[PDB]
């Protein structure tokens, strides 16, 4: 029972979480869903028979993500890395009436250390 | 976007989840999936045309576990909820080649360092 990409990052950086194709089945029941922290996983974007190959779910609007997808991947990007990215992501077909999500990621972001005048202190990593 | 109800919960506890069948399409297709925490979720449990109304993940035995299948309900049942029970549970139906995730719960637990000579140090927290 495969374990969930463990990514940490910071503000600004871009990103890339890697589902592959590679013993993919049906492109077109293919996906990712992200998952913010503490709500439901929502559908978010599926393979598309075009050129990048891919569409986003209709409800919604970023620039700052995109895909390469080709015949080995299935990888969403994200430029420059906001925090409310902070989220787990599967990738999943759709297969039967069950989905068998072949991966996804969990991206948290800062850790945290940022510059000293406003705040708390002690560190750290207690 | 719709939130998981977090359900902190003791050891030994018995705990129910909640999908409502109130707002399906085609109930052959909606069952639960099962995260452990940094894993990748895990098709679970499934609706079934049985008295009983379910059947569970060929993977899984665990006499724990049951739901509560009827007209009003798809509920997920917990006997003496322990620890590794933890994790989140989502309940959605597949559609075409989505799946929609129509709930689900964050179970965690104790909710502790449930003891008394923990404790490198503190107060708080946090």
């Known amino acids: 029972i495969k374990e969930l990409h463990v990514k940490t990052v910071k503000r600004g950086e871009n990103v890339t979480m890697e589902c592959s194709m590679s013993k993919v089945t049906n492109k ?9 922290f503490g709500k439901v996983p929502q559908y978010f974007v599926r393979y598309y028979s075009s050129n990048s190959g891919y ?29 409310d990215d902070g989220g787990e992501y599967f990738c999943g077909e759709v297969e039967g009436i069950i989905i068998k999500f072949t991966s996804g990621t969990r991206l948290q972001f800062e850790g945290s ?9 002690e560190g750290s990593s207690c």
């Open 28 to 36: 077109n029941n293919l996906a990712w869903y992200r998952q913010s």
């Open 55 to 83: 569409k986003f779910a209709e409800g919604f609007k970023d620039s700052r993500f995109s895909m390469t997808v080709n015949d080995q991947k299935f990888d969403l990007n994200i430029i420059g890395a906001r925090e």
């Open 113 to 121: 250390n940022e510059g000293s005048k406003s705040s708390d202190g």
